Short mmCIF file of C-alpha atoms and ligand atoms in Angstrom, two decimals:
data_model
loop_
_atom_site.label_atom_id
_atom_site.label_comp_id
_atom_site.label_asym_id
_atom_site.label_seq_id
_atom_site.Cartn_x
_atom_site.Cartn_y
_atom_site.Cartn_z
CA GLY A 1 29.81 18.42 -56.35
CA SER A 2 26.47 20.13 -56.99
CA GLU A 3 25.89 23.65 -55.75
CA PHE A 4 22.96 25.80 -54.62
CA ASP A 5 22.20 27.15 -58.12
CA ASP A 6 21.68 23.54 -59.31
CA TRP A 7 18.85 22.77 -56.90
CA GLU A 8 16.62 25.36 -58.41
CA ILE A 9 13.77 23.73 -60.34
CA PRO A 10 13.64 25.66 -63.57
CA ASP A 11 10.70 28.01 -63.87
CA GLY A 12 7.65 26.53 -65.55
CA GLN A 13 8.43 22.91 -64.71
CA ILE A 14 6.21 22.86 -61.68
CA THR A 15 2.47 23.38 -61.93
CA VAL A 16 1.16 24.48 -58.53
CA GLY A 17 -2.26 23.12 -57.59
CA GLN A 18 -4.61 22.61 -54.65
CA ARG A 19 -3.72 24.59 -51.54
CA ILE A 20 -3.29 22.19 -48.62
CA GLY A 21 -2.49 24.42 -45.64
CA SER A 22 0.02 26.14 -43.38
CA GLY A 23 3.34 24.63 -42.36
CA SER A 24 6.33 26.11 -40.58
CA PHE A 25 7.36 29.34 -42.34
CA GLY A 26 4.82 29.01 -45.19
CA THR A 27 1.96 27.55 -47.20
CA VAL A 28 1.86 24.03 -48.60
CA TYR A 29 0.40 23.30 -52.02
CA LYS A 30 0.13 20.14 -54.04
CA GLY A 31 1.97 20.23 -57.33
CA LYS A 32 3.20 18.54 -60.46
CA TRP A 33 6.79 18.35 -61.62
CA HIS A 34 7.51 15.15 -63.50
CA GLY A 35 5.42 13.48 -60.78
CA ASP A 36 3.41 14.67 -57.76
CA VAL A 37 5.26 17.05 -55.38
CA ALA A 38 4.47 19.19 -52.37
CA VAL A 39 5.39 22.88 -52.65
CA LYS A 40 5.76 25.08 -49.60
CA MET A 41 5.66 28.78 -50.47
CA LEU A 42 7.72 30.72 -47.97
CA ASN A 43 6.24 33.88 -46.49
CA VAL A 44 9.14 36.03 -47.72
CA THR A 45 8.40 38.67 -50.35
CA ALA A 46 11.64 40.51 -51.18
CA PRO A 47 14.68 38.63 -49.85
CA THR A 48 17.78 40.61 -48.78
CA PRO A 49 21.23 39.29 -49.76
CA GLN A 50 21.43 38.10 -46.14
CA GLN A 51 18.08 36.25 -46.25
CA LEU A 52 18.86 34.67 -49.58
CA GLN A 53 22.17 33.44 -48.15
CA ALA A 54 20.35 32.01 -45.12
CA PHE A 55 17.96 30.25 -47.45
CA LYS A 56 21.02 28.90 -49.21
CA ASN A 57 22.37 27.72 -45.85
CA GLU A 58 19.19 25.91 -44.88
CA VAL A 59 18.90 24.34 -48.35
CA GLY A 60 22.46 23.20 -47.86
CA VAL A 61 21.34 21.36 -44.73
CA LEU A 62 18.28 19.83 -46.46
CA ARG A 63 20.41 18.48 -49.31
CA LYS A 64 22.54 16.37 -46.96
CA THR A 65 19.93 15.17 -44.41
CA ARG A 66 18.48 12.03 -45.95
CA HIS A 67 16.60 9.00 -44.51
CA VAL A 68 13.75 6.68 -45.60
CA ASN A 69 11.57 8.21 -42.88
CA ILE A 70 11.90 11.93 -43.58
CA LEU A 71 10.66 13.86 -46.59
CA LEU A 72 13.02 14.10 -49.52
CA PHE A 73 14.12 17.60 -50.48
CA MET A 74 13.71 17.79 -54.23
CA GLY A 75 14.61 21.39 -54.95
CA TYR A 76 13.47 24.97 -54.64
CA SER A 77 11.70 27.38 -56.90
CA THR A 78 12.14 31.11 -57.26
CA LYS A 79 9.05 32.48 -59.01
CA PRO A 80 6.91 34.13 -57.76
CA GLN A 81 8.53 33.50 -54.39
CA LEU A 82 10.96 31.18 -52.67
CA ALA A 83 9.54 27.72 -52.16
CA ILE A 84 10.68 24.35 -50.89
CA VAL A 85 9.80 21.39 -53.12
CA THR A 86 9.49 17.92 -51.62
CA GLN A 87 7.92 14.53 -52.52
CA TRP A 88 4.18 14.11 -52.21
CA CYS A 89 2.60 11.83 -49.65
CA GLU A 90 -0.68 10.46 -51.04
CA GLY A 91 -1.59 9.16 -47.57
CA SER A 92 -1.75 12.74 -46.26
CA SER A 93 -0.94 13.22 -42.55
CA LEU A 94 -1.24 11.12 -39.45
CA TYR A 95 -3.36 13.89 -37.97
CA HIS A 96 -5.79 13.73 -40.87
CA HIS A 97 -6.18 9.97 -40.47
CA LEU A 98 -6.51 9.91 -36.69
CA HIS A 99 -8.49 13.07 -35.96
CA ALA A 100 -10.27 14.08 -39.15
CA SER A 101 -11.04 10.82 -41.00
CA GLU A 102 -11.02 8.81 -37.79
CA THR A 103 -9.35 6.08 -39.79
CA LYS A 104 -9.04 2.78 -37.92
CA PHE A 105 -5.53 1.46 -37.67
CA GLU A 106 -4.92 -2.02 -36.29
CA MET A 107 -2.37 -2.23 -33.48
CA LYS A 108 0.36 -3.67 -35.69
CA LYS A 109 0.01 -0.71 -38.07
CA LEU A 110 0.05 1.80 -35.19
CA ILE A 111 3.24 0.27 -33.93
CA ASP A 112 4.85 0.24 -37.34
CA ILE A 113 4.09 3.96 -37.68
CA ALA A 114 5.58 4.65 -34.27
CA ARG A 115 8.63 2.66 -35.25
CA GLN A 116 9.15 4.52 -38.50
CA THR A 117 8.62 7.86 -36.80
CA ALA A 118 11.23 6.91 -34.15
CA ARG A 119 13.68 5.89 -36.91
CA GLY A 120 13.17 9.27 -38.55
CA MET A 121 13.55 11.24 -35.34
CA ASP A 122 16.59 9.16 -34.39
CA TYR A 123 18.29 10.07 -37.66
CA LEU A 124 17.51 13.79 -37.19
CA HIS A 125 18.92 13.72 -33.66
CA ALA A 126 21.96 11.76 -34.85
CA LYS A 127 22.50 14.72 -37.18
CA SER A 128 22.07 17.02 -34.17
CA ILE A 129 18.86 18.48 -35.58
CA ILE A 130 16.12 19.53 -33.16
CA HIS A 131 12.72 19.32 -34.87
CA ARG A 132 10.86 21.68 -32.51
CA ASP A 133 7.56 21.06 -34.21
CA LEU A 134 6.88 17.35 -34.15
CA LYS A 135 3.14 16.53 -34.25
CA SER A 136 0.83 14.18 -36.14
CA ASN A 137 0.25 17.09 -38.59
CA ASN A 138 3.71 16.78 -40.06
CA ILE A 139 4.03 13.03 -40.02
CA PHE A 140 3.11 11.92 -43.50
CA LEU A 141 2.02 8.67 -45.06
CA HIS A 142 3.58 7.93 -48.41
CA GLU A 143 1.58 5.97 -50.95
CA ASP A 144 4.06 3.12 -50.42
CA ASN A 145 3.13 3.05 -46.73
CA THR A 146 6.38 4.59 -45.49
CA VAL A 147 6.27 7.28 -42.83
CA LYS A 148 7.82 10.62 -43.85
CA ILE A 149 8.55 13.20 -41.22
CA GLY A 150 8.32 16.81 -42.37
CA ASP A 151 8.70 20.35 -41.02
CA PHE A 152 12.20 19.61 -39.70
CA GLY A 153 13.88 22.10 -42.08
CA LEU A 154 15.03 25.70 -41.50
CA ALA A 155 16.03 24.66 -37.97
CA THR A 156 18.52 27.48 -37.30
CA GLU A 157 16.06 29.98 -38.75
CA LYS A 158 13.60 28.64 -36.14
CA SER A 159 15.90 29.42 -33.21
CA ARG A 160 15.74 33.13 -34.06
CA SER A 161 0.12 23.18 -31.40
CA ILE A 162 0.23 23.34 -27.60
CA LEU A 163 -0.77 19.68 -27.21
CA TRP A 164 2.72 18.45 -28.21
CA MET A 165 4.59 21.08 -26.11
CA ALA A 166 6.72 19.80 -23.23
CA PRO A 167 5.85 21.62 -19.99
CA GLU A 168 9.18 23.46 -19.87
CA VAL A 169 8.39 24.78 -23.35
CA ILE A 170 4.72 25.42 -22.61
CA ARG A 171 5.65 27.78 -19.78
CA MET A 172 8.65 29.53 -21.35
CA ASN A 173 15.70 28.60 -25.76
CA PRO A 174 13.60 25.92 -24.01
CA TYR A 175 13.58 23.53 -27.04
CA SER A 176 15.84 20.50 -26.85
CA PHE A 177 16.24 16.92 -27.98
CA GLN A 178 14.25 16.07 -24.86
CA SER A 179 11.36 18.33 -25.85
CA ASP A 180 11.33 16.45 -29.18
CA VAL A 181 11.07 13.26 -27.17
CA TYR A 182 8.02 14.63 -25.32
CA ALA A 183 6.22 15.64 -28.53
CA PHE A 184 6.87 12.11 -29.80
CA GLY A 185 5.30 10.88 -26.56
CA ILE A 186 2.17 12.80 -27.44
CA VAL A 187 2.21 11.24 -30.92
CA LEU A 188 2.41 7.81 -29.23
CA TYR A 189 -0.57 8.97 -27.16
CA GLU A 190 -2.46 9.92 -30.31
CA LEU A 191 -1.68 6.58 -31.87
CA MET A 192 -2.41 4.39 -28.88
CA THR A 193 -5.60 6.12 -27.75
CA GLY A 194 -6.91 7.29 -31.07
CA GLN A 195 -7.38 10.81 -29.68
CA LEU A 196 -5.79 14.12 -28.81
CA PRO A 197 -4.80 14.65 -25.19
CA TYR A 198 -7.05 16.80 -22.96
CA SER A 199 -10.10 16.34 -25.20
CA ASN A 200 -12.25 17.03 -22.10
CA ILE A 201 -10.84 20.55 -21.51
CA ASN A 202 -12.48 23.22 -23.68
CA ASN A 203 -10.17 26.12 -22.76
CA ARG A 204 -6.56 26.42 -23.96
CA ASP A 205 -5.52 28.66 -21.07
CA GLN A 206 -6.50 26.03 -18.53
CA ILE A 207 -4.36 23.56 -20.46
CA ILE A 208 -1.37 25.77 -21.12
CA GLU A 209 -0.43 26.38 -17.49
CA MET A 210 -1.73 23.27 -15.75
CA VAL A 211 0.47 21.28 -18.11
CA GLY A 212 3.12 23.94 -17.61
CA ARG A 213 3.07 23.80 -13.84
CA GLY A 214 2.55 20.04 -13.91
CA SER A 215 -0.94 19.46 -12.58
CA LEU A 216 -2.22 18.28 -15.98
CA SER A 217 -0.95 15.41 -18.14
CA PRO A 218 -2.57 13.08 -20.74
CA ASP A 219 -5.13 10.56 -19.47
CA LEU A 220 -3.44 7.22 -20.03
CA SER A 221 -6.66 5.32 -19.29
CA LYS A 222 -7.69 6.22 -22.86
CA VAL A 223 -5.07 3.83 -24.24
CA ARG A 224 -6.46 0.87 -26.23
CA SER A 225 -6.65 -2.48 -24.42
CA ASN A 226 -4.43 -4.31 -26.93
CA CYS A 227 -1.62 -1.70 -26.55
CA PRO A 228 1.53 -3.57 -25.49
CA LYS A 229 2.61 -2.94 -21.89
CA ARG A 230 6.06 -1.87 -23.03
CA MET A 231 4.55 0.69 -25.35
CA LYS A 232 2.50 2.13 -22.52
CA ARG A 233 5.63 2.29 -20.35
CA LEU A 234 7.68 4.01 -23.06
CA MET A 235 4.97 6.58 -23.64
CA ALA A 236 5.01 7.46 -19.93
CA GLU A 237 8.79 7.98 -20.04
CA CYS A 238 8.68 10.24 -23.10
CA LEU A 239 6.05 12.30 -21.27
CA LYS A 240 8.11 12.80 -18.08
CA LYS A 241 7.58 16.34 -16.83
CA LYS A 242 11.20 16.52 -15.76
CA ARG A 243 12.92 16.76 -19.13
CA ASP A 244 16.15 15.11 -18.04
CA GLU A 245 14.24 11.94 -17.10
CA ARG A 246 13.11 11.32 -20.70
CA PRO A 247 14.78 8.62 -22.82
CA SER A 248 16.68 9.59 -25.97
CA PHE A 249 15.83 8.34 -29.44
CA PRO A 250 18.44 5.58 -29.79
CA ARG A 251 16.76 4.12 -26.70
CA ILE A 252 13.19 4.87 -27.81
CA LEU A 253 13.79 3.17 -31.16
CA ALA A 254 15.48 0.15 -29.56
CA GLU A 255 12.51 -0.25 -27.22
CA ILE A 256 9.99 -0.04 -30.08
CA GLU A 257 12.06 -2.32 -32.36
CA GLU A 258 12.21 -5.16 -29.82
CA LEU A 259 8.66 -4.52 -28.67
CA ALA A 260 7.68 -4.94 -32.33
CA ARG A 261 9.43 -8.31 -32.67
CA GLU A 262 7.12 -9.57 -29.95
CA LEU A 263 4.21 -9.61 -32.44
CA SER B 1 -25.18 -12.73 -56.74
CA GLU B 2 -26.51 -12.49 -60.33
CA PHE B 3 -24.04 -10.88 -62.74
CA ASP B 4 -24.31 -7.14 -63.29
CA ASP B 5 -21.82 -5.78 -65.79
CA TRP B 6 -21.79 -2.31 -64.20
CA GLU B 7 -21.00 -3.56 -60.71
CA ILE B 8 -17.39 -3.24 -59.49
CA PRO B 9 -16.41 -6.44 -57.57
CA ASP B 10 -15.19 -6.35 -53.94
CA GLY B 11 -11.52 -6.54 -54.86
CA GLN B 12 -11.19 -4.00 -57.66
CA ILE B 13 -11.42 -0.56 -56.03
CA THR B 14 -8.75 0.87 -53.71
CA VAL B 15 -10.25 3.35 -51.28
CA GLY B 16 -7.92 6.20 -50.31
CA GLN B 17 -8.27 9.64 -48.76
CA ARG B 18 -11.51 10.38 -46.96
CA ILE B 19 -12.74 13.66 -48.42
CA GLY B 20 -16.04 14.39 -46.71
CA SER B 21 -19.82 14.15 -46.45
CA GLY B 22 -22.01 14.54 -49.52
CA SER B 23 -25.69 13.75 -49.77
CA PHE B 24 -26.51 10.25 -48.61
CA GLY B 25 -22.90 9.18 -47.97
CA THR B 26 -19.13 9.76 -47.54
CA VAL B 27 -16.79 10.64 -50.38
CA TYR B 28 -13.43 9.00 -50.95
CA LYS B 29 -10.65 9.37 -53.46
CA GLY B 30 -9.90 5.97 -54.86
CA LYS B 31 -8.36 4.00 -57.66
CA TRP B 32 -10.19 2.05 -60.34
CA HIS B 33 -7.90 1.83 -63.34
CA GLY B 34 -6.94 5.35 -62.32
CA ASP B 35 -8.24 8.01 -59.92
CA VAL B 36 -11.99 8.03 -59.22
CA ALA B 37 -14.21 9.42 -56.51
CA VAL B 38 -16.15 6.81 -54.48
CA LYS B 39 -19.15 7.75 -52.42
CA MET B 40 -20.00 5.18 -49.74
CA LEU B 41 -23.74 5.17 -49.14
CA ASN B 42 -25.34 5.35 -45.70
CA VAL B 43 -27.24 2.05 -46.17
CA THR B 44 -26.23 -0.54 -43.58
CA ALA B 45 -27.69 -3.99 -44.28
CA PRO B 46 -29.34 -3.59 -47.70
CA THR B 47 -32.34 -5.86 -48.28
CA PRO B 48 -32.68 -7.37 -51.76
CA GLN B 49 -35.62 -4.93 -51.86
CA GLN B 50 -33.58 -1.74 -51.47
CA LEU B 51 -30.90 -3.34 -53.64
CA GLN B 52 -33.42 -3.50 -56.52
CA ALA B 53 -34.42 0.08 -55.65
CA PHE B 54 -30.75 0.99 -55.88
CA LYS B 55 -30.28 -0.90 -59.14
CA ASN B 56 -33.15 1.20 -60.50
CA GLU B 57 -31.41 4.46 -59.47
CA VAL B 58 -28.32 3.12 -61.18
CA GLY B 59 -30.33 2.75 -64.40
CA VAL B 60 -31.38 6.37 -64.29
CA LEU B 61 -27.79 7.44 -63.47
CA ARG B 62 -26.35 5.71 -66.50
CA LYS B 63 -28.68 7.65 -68.82
CA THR B 64 -28.02 11.09 -67.38
CA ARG B 65 -24.96 12.32 -69.28
CA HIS B 66 -23.64 15.78 -70.04
CA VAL B 67 -20.16 17.34 -70.13
CA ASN B 68 -21.08 19.35 -67.03
CA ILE B 69 -22.22 16.65 -64.67
CA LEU B 70 -20.20 13.85 -63.14
CA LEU B 71 -20.08 10.58 -65.10
CA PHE B 72 -21.51 7.50 -63.37
CA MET B 73 -18.85 4.90 -63.93
CA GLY B 74 -19.90 2.03 -61.69
CA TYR B 75 -21.25 0.82 -58.40
CA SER B 76 -20.27 -1.62 -55.70
CA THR B 77 -22.24 -3.58 -53.13
CA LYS B 78 -19.33 -5.21 -51.33
CA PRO B 79 -17.85 -4.31 -49.06
CA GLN B 80 -20.39 -1.48 -49.06
CA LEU B 81 -23.02 0.30 -51.15
CA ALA B 82 -20.99 2.73 -53.32
CA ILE B 83 -21.22 5.00 -56.38
CA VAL B 84 -18.09 5.62 -58.48
CA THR B 85 -17.56 8.69 -60.72
CA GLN B 86 -14.61 10.58 -62.13
CA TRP B 87 -12.21 12.37 -59.84
CA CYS B 88 -12.06 16.15 -60.11
CA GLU B 89 -8.51 17.21 -59.08
CA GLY B 90 -9.70 20.82 -58.78
CA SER B 91 -11.87 19.75 -55.84
CA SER B 92 -15.11 21.72 -55.19
CA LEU B 93 -16.08 25.34 -55.81
CA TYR B 94 -16.81 25.63 -52.08
CA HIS B 95 -13.31 24.52 -51.06
CA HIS B 96 -11.70 27.10 -53.36
CA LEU B 97 -13.99 29.98 -52.51
CA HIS B 98 -14.41 29.58 -48.79
CA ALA B 99 -11.50 27.46 -47.59
CA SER B 100 -8.58 28.20 -49.90
CA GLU B 101 -9.93 31.64 -50.75
CA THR B 102 -8.57 31.03 -54.23
CA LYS B 103 -8.78 34.27 -56.19
CA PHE B 104 -10.53 33.69 -59.47
CA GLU B 105 -10.58 36.30 -62.21
CA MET B 106 -13.97 37.64 -63.19
CA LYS B 107 -13.74 35.83 -66.53
CA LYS B 108 -13.14 32.50 -64.85
CA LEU B 109 -15.95 33.03 -62.34
CA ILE B 110 -18.39 33.72 -65.14
CA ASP B 111 -17.17 30.68 -67.01
CA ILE B 112 -17.89 28.58 -63.92
CA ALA B 113 -21.34 30.14 -63.70
CA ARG B 114 -21.84 29.44 -67.41
CA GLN B 115 -20.79 25.81 -67.11
CA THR B 116 -22.89 25.23 -64.04
CA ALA B 117 -25.99 26.67 -65.77
CA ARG B 118 -25.35 24.39 -68.75
CA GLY B 119 -25.28 21.38 -66.42
CA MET B 120 -28.45 22.50 -64.63
CA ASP B 121 -30.15 23.18 -67.99
CA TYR B 122 -29.51 19.65 -69.14
CA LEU B 123 -30.86 18.18 -65.87
CA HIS B 124 -33.98 20.33 -66.03
CA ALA B 125 -34.61 19.38 -69.66
CA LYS B 126 -34.62 15.77 -68.43
CA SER B 127 -37.16 16.84 -65.79
CA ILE B 128 -34.64 16.21 -63.02
CA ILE B 129 -34.82 18.27 -59.85
CA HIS B 130 -31.37 18.45 -58.23
CA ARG B 131 -32.65 19.39 -54.75
CA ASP B 132 -29.22 20.04 -53.24
CA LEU B 133 -27.25 22.33 -55.50
CA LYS B 134 -24.51 24.22 -53.65
CA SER B 135 -20.82 25.09 -54.07
CA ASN B 136 -19.98 21.88 -52.18
CA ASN B 137 -21.10 19.70 -55.04
CA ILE B 138 -19.95 21.77 -57.91
CA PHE B 139 -16.62 20.26 -58.87
CA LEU B 140 -13.75 21.56 -60.99
CA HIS B 141 -12.09 18.92 -63.13
CA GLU B 142 -8.33 18.95 -63.87
CA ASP B 143 -9.12 20.11 -67.42
CA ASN B 144 -11.10 23.09 -66.11
CA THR B 145 -14.60 21.73 -66.91
CA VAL B 146 -17.26 22.12 -64.23
CA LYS B 147 -18.83 18.85 -63.03
CA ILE B 148 -22.08 18.99 -61.06
CA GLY B 149 -22.71 16.13 -58.64
CA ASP B 150 -25.04 15.06 -55.81
CA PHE B 151 -28.05 14.95 -58.16
CA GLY B 152 -28.34 11.13 -58.09
CA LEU B 153 -30.80 9.03 -56.10
CA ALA B 154 -33.52 11.60 -56.83
CA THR B 155 -36.36 9.18 -56.11
CA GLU B 156 -34.58 8.17 -52.89
CA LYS B 157 -34.48 11.78 -51.70
CA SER B 158 -28.01 21.09 -42.12
CA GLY B 159 -25.34 23.46 -43.45
CA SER B 160 -27.20 23.23 -46.74
CA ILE B 161 -29.79 25.80 -45.64
CA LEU B 162 -27.92 28.75 -47.18
CA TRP B 163 -29.00 27.59 -50.64
CA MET B 164 -32.62 26.83 -49.64
CA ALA B 165 -35.42 28.87 -51.25
CA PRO B 166 -37.76 30.53 -48.74
CA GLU B 167 -40.64 28.20 -49.74
CA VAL B 168 -38.22 25.30 -49.15
CA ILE B 169 -36.78 26.36 -45.80
CA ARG B 170 -40.23 26.81 -44.22
CA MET B 171 -41.94 23.77 -45.72
CA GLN B 172 -38.95 21.47 -45.36
CA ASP B 173 -41.17 18.55 -44.28
CA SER B 174 -43.47 18.70 -47.32
CA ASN B 175 -41.41 17.90 -50.40
CA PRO B 176 -41.14 21.63 -51.34
CA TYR B 177 -38.42 21.13 -53.94
CA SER B 178 -38.99 22.34 -57.51
CA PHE B 179 -37.26 23.41 -60.69
CA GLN B 180 -37.71 26.90 -59.29
CA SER B 181 -36.09 26.16 -55.91
CA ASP B 182 -33.11 24.77 -57.86
CA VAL B 183 -32.92 28.10 -59.67
CA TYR B 184 -32.76 29.92 -56.34
CA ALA B 185 -29.98 27.58 -55.16
CA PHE B 186 -28.17 28.56 -58.34
CA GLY B 187 -28.67 32.21 -57.45
CA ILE B 188 -26.93 31.62 -54.16
CA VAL B 189 -24.09 30.03 -56.10
CA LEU B 190 -23.90 33.12 -58.34
CA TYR B 191 -23.82 35.12 -55.12
CA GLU B 192 -20.81 33.10 -53.88
CA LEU B 193 -19.02 33.54 -57.22
CA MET B 194 -19.68 37.27 -57.44
CA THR B 195 -19.01 38.20 -53.81
CA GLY B 196 -16.54 35.52 -52.78
CA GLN B 197 -18.57 34.65 -49.70
CA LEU B 198 -21.34 32.67 -48.11
CA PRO B 199 -24.49 34.74 -47.62
CA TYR B 200 -25.44 35.73 -44.04
CA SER B 201 -21.82 35.28 -42.88
CA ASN B 202 -22.43 38.06 -40.31
CA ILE B 203 -25.15 36.14 -38.44
CA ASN B 204 -24.48 33.52 -35.75
CA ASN B 205 -27.88 31.82 -35.38
CA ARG B 206 -28.85 29.27 -38.03
CA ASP B 207 -32.32 29.24 -36.51
CA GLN B 208 -32.62 32.98 -37.08
CA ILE B 209 -31.62 32.49 -40.70
CA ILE B 210 -34.22 29.73 -41.20
CA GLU B 211 -37.02 31.78 -39.67
CA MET B 212 -36.10 35.04 -41.40
CA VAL B 213 -35.34 33.49 -44.78
CA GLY B 214 -38.63 31.60 -44.40
CA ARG B 215 -40.71 34.75 -43.82
CA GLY B 216 -39.03 36.45 -46.76
CA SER B 217 -37.50 39.03 -44.44
CA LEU B 218 -33.82 37.93 -44.80
CA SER B 219 -32.10 37.72 -48.16
CA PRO B 220 -28.53 37.87 -49.53
CA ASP B 221 -26.98 41.36 -49.34
CA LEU B 222 -26.19 42.04 -53.00
CA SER B 223 -24.12 45.16 -52.27
CA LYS B 224 -21.30 42.77 -51.33
CA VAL B 225 -20.81 41.91 -55.00
CA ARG B 226 -17.33 42.74 -56.38
CA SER B 227 -17.08 46.10 -58.12
CA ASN B 228 -16.49 44.42 -61.49
CA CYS B 229 -19.44 41.99 -61.41
CA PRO B 230 -21.25 42.81 -64.67
CA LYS B 231 -24.61 44.56 -64.36
CA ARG B 232 -26.35 41.73 -66.28
CA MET B 233 -25.01 39.10 -63.84
CA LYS B 234 -26.09 41.10 -60.77
CA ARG B 235 -29.63 41.44 -62.21
CA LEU B 236 -29.79 37.72 -63.11
CA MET B 237 -28.73 36.88 -59.56
CA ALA B 238 -31.53 39.00 -58.16
CA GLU B 239 -34.07 37.29 -60.50
CA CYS B 240 -32.91 33.82 -59.44
CA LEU B 241 -33.34 34.95 -55.84
CA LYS B 242 -36.93 36.28 -56.08
CA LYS B 243 -39.01 35.13 -53.11
CA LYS B 244 -41.96 34.42 -55.45
CA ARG B 245 -40.86 31.21 -57.10
CA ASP B 246 -42.89 31.51 -60.29
CA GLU B 247 -41.16 34.86 -60.78
CA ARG B 248 -37.76 33.13 -61.01
CA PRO B 249 -36.34 32.63 -64.51
CA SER B 250 -35.99 29.14 -65.98
CA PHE B 251 -32.61 27.61 -66.87
CA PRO B 252 -32.94 27.92 -70.60
CA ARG B 253 -33.13 31.67 -70.04
CA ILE B 254 -30.51 31.79 -67.29
CA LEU B 255 -28.13 29.97 -69.62
CA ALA B 256 -28.76 32.21 -72.63
CA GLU B 257 -28.37 35.33 -70.53
CA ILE B 258 -25.00 34.17 -69.14
CA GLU B 259 -23.76 33.09 -72.58
CA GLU B 260 -24.33 36.59 -74.00
CA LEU B 261 -23.07 38.61 -71.06
CA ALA B 262 -19.90 36.49 -71.20
CA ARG B 263 -19.53 37.26 -74.90
CA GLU B 264 -19.58 40.98 -74.11
CA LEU B 265 -16.14 40.29 -72.62
CL1 CL C 1 22.67 25.04 -50.75
CL1 CL C 2 16.47 15.11 -54.73
#
């Protein structure tokens, strides 16, 4: 029975702190409410009655999409600008661990992260939400070791980073549940290899079309030796160039769940 | 082995976010009865000989205390050689200036300069040469106090060249460091505060910078200072940046001068 007005965090209750970086539609800062929060300042200066109502509509979606493996929407703030407030993940991002700290995860941990990410993506798809922007950069590690997917919000506003782009997207509308599945395949690649795909190609433009046409795909030889065979097989499916040949997330999760029992 | 009441045992620190490289090791956020910073030292298999050398640095670190330098709170040996200090939630001056492009007010900038000079004044009164002062190891605490770090392991003592005095950059293999080369480093820091940038940002070749800064023929372009940088601060900056090192002012005078010019506001 709550309404949009009630999800505003009263002015002054959030102290905004260290700037973290850019996310979809805005800038992410660390903050303090009663506890740690993340605050994403939206890039909108003076919102028209139509843009405010759209913000209301998206917020309405965020309020009802809830799962242990996606960020919790905690409210929005109005001054100085519209902002989305969420819980803070002390473990930062998967990207930061894999590619910036070069943190060493053991195989069991890699697989647990893949499993939690698949659970999260499965829930979003079950709610008919297309993420469009899945990458290790917006997969977060909570202090309690849970995976929290982020950047799934403002989906409709979206329908108005090339490494995770399915070829049909990378050459072109083109976004689908199946393109989400591909980006997840790249995240599996990141996890199972410890590196970004195409690390041997220095020019984007070479990558953009070769992957687009289909003459370039991730080098699977870079996969760790203790990576389960099933996991390798699943990754290859999610990365199918023909989008209709990719598995869906109920299937992906089932495959990772069972594959995880064997351990 | 052999009890040391300042050592933190192998189980008691939780290492968290990797932050980055500081002198002589890697910095981590961590937990020891609360947030701390943990710097893991680049020593692999420490002999009991370097361990005693380290224990001696630790003795000096304990005694070096001032509101404007990091507090040495403990060390570890297992699983790795590490120094623990307080955590500064405000991160470094470098991160704000050149990564976040945080926009500080002139008053705040001058307060940071004032607090950093106080820290450097204390060190120099204890006859300590920092040797590596730069915006990267000037930290802002949650409570707004400036905390200087990276001054430890002085007896034990890249992108750091921007802060290197000309006599330092050209005699790098000859222990060129002095109280006066610290003062220059501080002048580069004033430069960053007053212009919002790294000096020589328009030049691509580090080697060109080393050579030119070494010959005295390249120096920070002081015209790039904000329009409202006080005249006294711009002059101080230029004195700290003198190529003749004995012509640079000492920190008691640098401090006094900043105190007053800040009062005029
Ligand atoms: Cl709403
Ligand atoms: Cl909530």
